């Protein structure tokens, strides 16, 4: 399963 | 240098898919389509905020060339003793409209315009109990007048505040509750941390009975403590040169808590 770096979701969000 | 990359990685943060996060997202998606206001409650380390951020990062602001962004989900966090003008200020800034000087009715009329113009479907309010009691009039207003699912997020304190007013309690009765990990669910989650988050080069076999007597006692089932305890034990082990955690070093970390 995938686990998301919280700063990568912060970078990829609009 | 090998060590210093791992020490930087371990001090960072990540979102792990877990059942409690998956269970919230499939409930919030239902409330977004049905336009129903509701509340997420639970204890102060269950990871409610990471679950709500993980949801904000699913529905990203869609863009059309010359228009305000289409923003399906808004998430805000109020400051302490938040007044009506402070709530409206933040909703307006989040949608990327700069906030000029004015009176509370100017801020209200502008917030109501931008919530319509950006096509908002859900408004998630974290730490809802920082709101001053009168502001709830403006929160109920947004939710009855606009088609917006207001979600209030908070600890048991929130309900003690809410029960002071029938008018609010009744808009926000539907709730999902976050709990603590136990039994097989705590045991399975420790293995997910070992493989997916710690990534230590020798396996620490943290699911063993002697390691789980430490972790279950120290973390009390909170995901907040589990992430903090294990990252500290991994930083401390690698900076001492061991390629995996051991019974005495995890005991040294757990003794502080």
């Amino acid at each position: 399963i995938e686990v998301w770096d919280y700063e990568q979701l912060r970078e990829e969000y609009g | 240098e090998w060590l210093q990359a791992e020490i930087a990685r371990l001090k960072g943060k990540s979102i792990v898919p877990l059942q409690q996060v998956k269970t919230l997202h499939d409930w919030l998606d239902g409330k977004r389509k049905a336009r129903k206001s509701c509340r997420v409650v639970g204890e102060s380390r269950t990871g409610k905020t990471v679950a709500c951020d993980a949801y904000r990062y699913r529905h990203k602001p869609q863009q059309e060339a010359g228009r305000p962004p289409t923003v399906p989900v808004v998430y805000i966090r109020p400051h302490q003793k938040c007044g009506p003008k402070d709530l409206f200020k933040k909703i307006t800034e989040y949608l990327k409209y700069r906030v000029t000087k004015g009176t509370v009715s100017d801020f209200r009329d502008r917030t109501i315009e931008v919530l319509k113009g950006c096509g908002v479907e859900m408004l998630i309010i974290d730490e809802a109990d920082r709101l001053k009691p009168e502001t709830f009039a403006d929160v109920r207003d947004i939710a009855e007048d606009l088609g917006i699912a207001v979600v209030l997020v908070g600890t048991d304190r929130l309900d003690a505040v809410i029960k002071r007013d029938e008018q609010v309690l009744e808009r926000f009765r539907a709730h999902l509750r976050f709990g603590k990990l136990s039994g097989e669910d705590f045991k399975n989650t420790v293995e997910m941390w070992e493989q997916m988050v710690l990534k230590l080069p020798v396996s620490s076999n943290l699911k063993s009975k002697e390691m789980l007597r430490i972790l279950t006692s120290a973390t009390e089932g909170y995901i907040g403590r589990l992430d903090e305890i294990l990252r500290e034990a991994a930083i401390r082990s690698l900076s001492r040169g061991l390629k995996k955690i051991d019974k005495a070093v995890l005991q040294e970390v757990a003794k502080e808590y």
């Binding site: - | 600890t155 048991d156 304190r157 309900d159 003690a160 029960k163």
Partner: protein
């Protein structure tokens, strides 16, 4: 009290739901042989109902009869120490 606390025989108790009821009055129901845990009941529609179990913070693994807590409290008040 605020934050779901109850005070009883100088011990301070907290429990799983109490914070949502702050300012209400609850009927504590307790065993004098061991007061480290108390059952909390509340009144709804003039019908008493069970609310939660409240546990004396930081001594959940001990035991105290009410007589031990009362006698020790007198010694603390006589000594002049905080409780």
């Amino acid at each position: 009290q605020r934050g779901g606390c109850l005070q009883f025989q100088n011990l301070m108790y907290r429990g799983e739901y109490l914070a949502g009821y702050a300012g209400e009055t609850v009927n504590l129901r307790f065993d004098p042989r061991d007061i480290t845990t108390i059952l909390v009941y509340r009144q709804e529609n003039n019908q008493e109902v069970f609310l939660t179990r409240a546990h004396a913070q930081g001594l959940e693994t001990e035991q105290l009869a009410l007589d031990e807590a009362e006698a020790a409290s007198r010694r603390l008040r006589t000594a002049g120490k905080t409780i």
